[PDB]
Amino acid sequence: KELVLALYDYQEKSPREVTMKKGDILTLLNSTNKDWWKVEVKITVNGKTYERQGFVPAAYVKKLD
Ligand SMILES: [Cl-]
Ligand SMILES: [Cl-]
């Protein structure tokens, strides 16, 4: 899929948002809302990869693709 770069830190404002740190690279899922983009974060637990999706401000991310 498409990637985006975190321009600035962002603290999630609800469970439906994701927290970013400046310099993070995330997957872009949906950018059709002008203000809020749905992105995807990955974690690993015991060597297995899980994913969580949620909104961040479109202005806080830059498309890399
Ligand atoms: Cl920052
Ligand atoms: Cl962009």
Amino acid at 4: V
- Nearest listed ligand to the Cα of residue 11: 1
* Concatenated DSSP letters of 7-61: -S-B--SSTTB--B-TT-EEEEEE--SSSEEEEEEEEEETTEEEEEEEEEEGGGE
How far apart are the CA of 22 and the centre of ligand 2, in A? 15
Calculate how far, in angstroms, residue 10's C-alpha sits from the geometric centre of ligand 2.
16
Could you tell me the domains of the chain? Answer: 1-65 (2.30.30.40)
Tell me, rounded to whole angstroms, the distance of Cα 22 from its chain centroid.
11
Q: How was this structure determined?
A: X-ray
CA distance 31 to 34: 7
Structure's resolution in angstroms: 1.9
Nearest of 1, 19, 2 to residue 62 by alpha carbon: 2
Amino acid at 21: K
The first and second tokens of residue 17, run together, are: 């948002």
Neighbours of 3 (CB within 10 A): 14
Q: What's the gap in Å between 43 CA and the centre of ligand 2?
A: 24
Tell me how far the alpha carbon of residue 20 lies from the centroid of ligand 1, in angstroms.
9
> Which among 29, 23, 22 has a CA at the least distance from the CA of 51?
29
